[PDB]
Amino acid sequence: LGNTTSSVILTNYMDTQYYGEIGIGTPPQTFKVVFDTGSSNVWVPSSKCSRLYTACVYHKLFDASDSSSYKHNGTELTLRYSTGTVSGFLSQDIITVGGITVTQMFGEVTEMPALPFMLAEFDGVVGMGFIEQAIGRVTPIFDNIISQGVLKEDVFSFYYNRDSQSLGGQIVLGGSDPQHYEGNFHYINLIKTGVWQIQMKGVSVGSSTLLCEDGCLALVDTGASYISGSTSSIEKLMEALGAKKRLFDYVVKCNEGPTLPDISFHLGGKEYTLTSADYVFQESYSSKKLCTLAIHAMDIPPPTGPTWALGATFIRKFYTEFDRRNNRIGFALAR
Ligand SMILES: CC(C)(C)OC(=O)N[C@@H]1CNC[C@H](C(=O)N(Cc2cccc(Cl)c2Cl)C2CC2)C1
Ligand SMILES: *[C@@H]1O[C@H](CO)[C@@H](O)[C@H](O)[C@H]1NC(C)=O
């Protein structure tokens, strides 16, 4: 253990995407990336991506021919995401993340489907998960940063702000920033190592524990935009809110959004409550317009799922600390 705590400033895009900058190669090629606790691989779009993938034409591409620090690998890599899929191959190069430089193995993506990557403001993803979830058993960037013995502590923490021209968010590698949280952290120990998943002991709509009464799983996913549950759990939840299912989202009439009940998540000791201002995209107060909720269905497949996922919707209210040393997640009220 060292005495270094570095931070990555994040950009908040529409309260759904939070991305910072990383630099790959010599000289550095910069990419906008999402720091994802629900995955463990690093990947950026490749120059080897065909121009027929319209997503590739609209994102920064890594070119190994312009990097003197590049080391070829070539092993195939397929990443099947709950939202889509990416294929490419592995490569090793020097990666800079908040003043920390690490030699890192990552995927050069050559197949990037338009839907959903034409909606991505970010170029790629920096997986903040454990080696146990890394496709091709590639050493994750945080495990490589830990190995340097440069960090003050074996933790990293997230701050995600409400959309505004202010700070979008922040990741602190090696600690937590007290300027973005109040009170003290309440920890919840991980069920098992290998996943950033904890036990949840009930989801309540208002006063009545409407779901997860006999306990259920909660994945603390910085890479997920919304709060997610199973199709059955979300169907029951939305019926309790009066929410009408559209194709991809759930909506309410804009005028009845501020009246919607509080939603609570029973984790560790505490009840983590979100008011309707925390989960409704309150775009108007019109009885003639529809307002989307920041909760959606996601049937995650085993071993990880079925599970709930506490994404950006949760992290905006609760500043989150991911402790690798003690295999726990700490929450504090964000500020
Ligand atoms: C099986 C395994 C590979 C581990 O599963 C996962 O990695 N599962 C991922 C877990 N974390 C959320 C990930 C995600 O959905 N996106 C996509 C995304 C989010 C918001 C907006 C857009 Cl446009 C997109 Cl594309 C990645 C950027 C983080 C899926
Ligand atoms: C790619 O990386 C892995 C990392 O463990 C290494 O063992 C393997 O030999 C590499 N493959 C090639 C083709 O260089």
From Swiss-Prot:
Ordered alphabetically, the record's keywords are:
Aspartyl protease, Cleavage on pair of basic residues, Disease variant, Disulfide bond, Glycoprotein, Hydrolase, Membrane, Protease, Secreted, Signal, Zymogen
Q: Where is the active site?
A: 36, 221
Might you give the EC number(s) for this enzyme? 3.4.23.15
Q: Which family does it belong to?
A: Belongs to the peptidase A1 family.
Name it. Answer: Renin
Q: Which GO MF term does the entry hold, naming one?
A: signaling receptor binding
State the covered range within the intact protein. Answer: 69 to 406 of 406
Q: Highest taxon of the source?
A: Eukaryota
Species per Swiss-Prot/TrEMBL record:
Homo sapiens (Human)
Q: Which cysteines are joined by disulfide bonds?
A: 49-56, 212-216, 254-291
Gene from which this protein is expressed: REN
